[PDB]
Design a protein around this ligand. Structure first.
Ligand SMILES: CC(=O)N[C@@H]1[C@@H](O)[C@H](O)[C@@H](CO)O[C@H]1O
Ligand SMILES: *[C@@H]1O[C@H](CO)[C@@H](O)[C@H](O)[C@H]1NC(C)=O
Ligand SMILES: *[C@@H]1O[C@H](CO)[C@@H](O)[C@H](O)[C@H]1NC(C)=O
Ligand SMILES: *[C@@H]1O[C@H](CO)[C@@H](O)[C@H](O)[C@H]1NC(C)=O
Ligand SMILES: *[C@@H]1O[C@H](CO)[C@@H](O)[C@H](O)[C@H]1NC(C)=O
Ligand SMILES: *[C@@H]1O[C@H](CO)[C@@H](O)[C@H](O)[C@H]1NC(C)=O
Lengths: 199, 262, 247, 50
């Protein structure tokens, strides 16, 4: 990053800090464990957690009697599963492949820009100050010209690539937004949109 | 230049980043290891509330340790330090508000009451709790019907070009010089054609779902609910209804454009 | 009746619409009025639409202005390049000028393609909205409007579509003490379609989105199990319409 | 610098496009996370039926 501070590649920081992002998610969680699915439409209406689960069970088809009767089993099962999730997340190879991929891809392109800087681009030298030295204005200009054309092309290539990649990231965001609205703020009937099985 | 901590062997002399640029040098007279760094640049952002309200402005420097940096502009007081960079014309207020003009790293700027421009750490929303008792429920005692809005773009503008006309005006020798190069001119035109055709197709899919054009019954008695505003009025020459016509007037493009011979 | 079928879908029983028809009418009529005023005012609501036209105009202007660039030669007018220059030398200046203009054209066409892909995505979304929200009623939360969605009405606008979504939003809230199930004579009775609320004295059954207390009879309940396993069972009385008729 | 000025607006255009990418990234984050206004808080008593 600082080495990029030495060529003109100024990496700008975020607008919403990670602390603020954490606050937002915690509010969504503390709304779906206390006010059911009214925390997105209208105002928050309190409901005991047992009752909230019963309504959701009625949706998939199983009648409410099952949940209220065998509550013990459901509780233990859920608790144990959360345990497995944290364990597996930490104990695996990559898992978060997609997230890591984005970072690596962007970095590769940035690095390539800094490497093309040293290419002769069909001239006599790479350093423009060195080109100036030992070259009469006339010839120096035609050599400066050769170098300029090369560098300009490289920067144009980079910008075009970035714009195409940006579209991909934005698409994934739109999918994520749809999920936050259907799965978190309610219950989805669309099969396999939120999870494997009955959501 | 600064004194280094690097350990060079007696044959070694200069430094190199992966960018293959000198990072250090041995004094050819004292034989000591020095470190190079060009001074601190960045880029400049100007904040303004908009000319209509005032003529004061604020300045930001896209990241510089402003503990000693200070373009033709002058300086003054009120130096504040964020993580993003160096502000000149705010105030570290201890309040907090909704974000109005973004700056970065949780800092948002605005104008307020003697009135001047200020800054603040952005707050999200108003706090409130939900009394959770294992035996308490809340059923609403009434209802409210509301109509909201939503806009979504459908098409762009069909454009076409001509090689010889733009690249080589009318010069025949220039045309011969363009003929030397390959079918660059040809391929280009085809791509612009593709866009134009697809753009028209988009419009059809969105609106063309009705097979038979239906017509509203003469008597407009729909159980109390009026629909006059949205229902097209035949008396108005343009079949467009009240709301539709208003929308059309607002969106204006002839400012930099011409007319609907073009 | 059409409104009442849609009301049934969101949860409230048809009873609500038929009873307070007038109030519903007034609210809908008044709201439509405000939308007209809001469109006429706040001249920023029309945003995305204007943006499209703004972008295309800027790009077109760019291409035209680039014509006036030496692109590393002697002049701009091709005829002026020919003037006061031998064909051989003029050719090298013409060569430079041509490549310069050609590069600019390629850039413009590339930019247009990328922008048009975004427009396509927007149109496909609008197609789904028209098919679901207009020709039907969608239960997908927030896909149409905000809250439980009733109906939607489409309107046209320059290079675009404006949807006016009509939505039902629950309002004034209260406080009722509740309980999972009621046991009468050894057998437990679970709520059939509502939630057993208690206004302090007696126990009643009500819909989950509007307050309408009805006496707990055998018809609004289903028997299951024995009252002892249900965690927080209470105790009241199930009326049962039978003995009155028998006697 | 003098030679570059002659080439044209090939420095202005590039800068503008990169600015666009950055501002759209800010919009993405806001849309996905911010959908609830009133920040809600957890009850101290943790008795969520087991
Ligand atoms: C008697 C018996 O085997 N019971 C099973 C056993 O797996 C466990 O007691 C419980 C887990 O909650 O599931 C059931
Ligand atoms: C050069 O000058 C420095 C200081 O004046 C002296 O120490 C040194 O001996 C001189 N000669 C060389 C070869 O460095
Ligand atoms: C500003 O510069 C000084 C240099 O002495 C350095 O300590 C730091 O980067 C800044 N000052 C602070 C915040 O300590
Ligand atoms: C603002 O907050 C800072 C840090 O908490 C404090 O030092 C300062 O006195 C506060 N200013 C006022 C006017 O309360
Ligand atoms: C209700 O919640 C409180 C707090 O945990 C407590 O009285 C009890 O554990 C819960 N259940 C009852 C009262 O049946
Ligand atoms: C429910 O009753 C409690 C009793 O004190 C009260 O504090 C609370 O505000 C009531 N809920 C609502 C939504 O009014």
């Amino acid at each position: 990053i600082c080495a990029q501070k030495f060529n003109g590649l100024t990496v700008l920081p975020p607008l919403l800090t990670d602390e603020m992002i954490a606050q937002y998610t915690s509010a969504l969680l503390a709304g779906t464990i206390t006010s059911g699915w009214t925390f997105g439409a209208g105002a928050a209406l309190q409901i005991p957690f047992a009752m909230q689960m019963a309504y959701r069970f009625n949706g998939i088809g199983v009648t409410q009697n099952v949940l209220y009767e065998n509550q013990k089993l459901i509780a233990n099962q859920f608790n144990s599963a959360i345990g497995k999730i944290q364990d597996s997340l930490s104990s695996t190879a990559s898992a978060l492949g997609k997230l890591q991929d984005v970072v690596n891809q962007n970095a590769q392109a940035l690095n390539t820009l800094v490497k093309q800087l040293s290419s002769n681009f069909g001239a006599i030298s790479s350093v423009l100050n060195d080109i100036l030295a030992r070259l009469d204005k006339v010839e120096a200009e035609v050599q400066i010209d050769r170098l300029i054309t090369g560098r300009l092309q490289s920067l144009q290539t980079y910008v075009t690539q970035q714009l195409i990649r940006a579209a991909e990231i934005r698409a994934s965001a739109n999918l994520a937004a749809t999920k936050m609205s259907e799965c978190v703020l309610g219950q989805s009937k669309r099969v396999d949109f939120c999870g494997k099985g009955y959501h | 230049l600064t004194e280094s901590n690097k350990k060079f062997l007696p044959f070694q002399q200069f430094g190199r980043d992966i960018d293959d640029t000198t990072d250090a040098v041995r004094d050819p007279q004292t034989l000591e290891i020095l470190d190079i760094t060009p001074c601190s640049f960045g880029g400049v952002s100007v904040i303004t509330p908009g000319t209509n309200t005032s003529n004061q402005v604020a300045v930001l420097y896209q990241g510089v340790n402003c503990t000693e940096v200070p373009r033709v502009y002058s300086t003054g007081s009120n130096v504040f330090q964020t993580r993003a960079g160096c502000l000149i014309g705010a105030e570290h207020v201890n309040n907090s508000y909704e974000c109005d003009i973004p700056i970065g790293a949780g800092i948002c700027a605005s104008y307020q009451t003697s009135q001047s421009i200020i800054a603040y750490t952005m707050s999200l929303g108003v706090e409130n709790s939900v009394a959770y008792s294992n035996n308490s429920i809340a059923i609403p005692i009434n209802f409210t019907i509301s109509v909201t809005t939503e806009i979504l773009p459908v098409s762009m503008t069909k454009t076409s070009v001509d090689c010889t006309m733009y690249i080589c005006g009318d010069s025949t020798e220039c045309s011969n010089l363009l003929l030397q190069y390959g079918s660059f001119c040809t391929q280009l035109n085809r791509a612009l054609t593709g866009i134009a055709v697809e753009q028209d197709k988009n419009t059809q899919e969105v609106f063309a779902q009705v097979k038979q054009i239906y017509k509203t019954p003469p008597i407009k008695d729909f159980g109390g609910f009026n629909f006059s505003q949205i229902l097209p009025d035949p008396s108005k020459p343009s079949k467009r209804s009240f709301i539709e016509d208003l929308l059309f007037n607002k969106v204006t493009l002839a400012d930099a454009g011409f007319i609907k011979d073009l | 009746m059409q409104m009442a079928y849609r009301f049934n879908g969101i949860g409230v029983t048809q009873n609500v619409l038929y009873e307070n028809q007038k109030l519903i009418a007034n609210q809908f009529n008044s709201a439509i009025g405000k939308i007209q005023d809001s469109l006429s005012s706040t001249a920023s609501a029309l945003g995305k639409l204007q943006d499209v036209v703004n972008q295309n105009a800027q790009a077109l202007n760019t291409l035209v202005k680039q014509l006036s660039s030496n692109f590393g030669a002697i002049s701009s007018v091709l005829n002026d390049i020919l003037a006061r220059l031998d064909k051989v030398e003029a050719e090298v200046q013409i060569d430079r000028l041509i490549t310069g203009r050609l590069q600019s054209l390629q850039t413009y066409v590339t930019q247009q393609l990328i922008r048009a892909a975004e427009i396509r995505a927007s149109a496909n979304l609008a197609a789904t909205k028209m098919s679901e929200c207009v020709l039907g009623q969608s239960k997908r939360v927030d896909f149409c409007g905000k809250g439980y969605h009733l109906m939607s009405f489409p309107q046209s606008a320059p290079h675009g579509v404006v949807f006016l979504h009509v939505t039902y939003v629950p309002a004034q809230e209260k406080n009722f003490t509740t309980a999972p199930a009621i046991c009468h004579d050894g057998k437990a009775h679970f709520p059939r379609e509502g939630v057993f609320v208690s206004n302090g004295t007696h126990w009643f059954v009500t819909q989950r989105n509007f307050y309408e207390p009805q006496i707990i009879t055998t018809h609004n309940t289903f028997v299951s199990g024995n009252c002892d396993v249900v965690i927080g069972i209470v105790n009241n009385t199930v009326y049962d319409p039978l003995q009155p008729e028998l006697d």
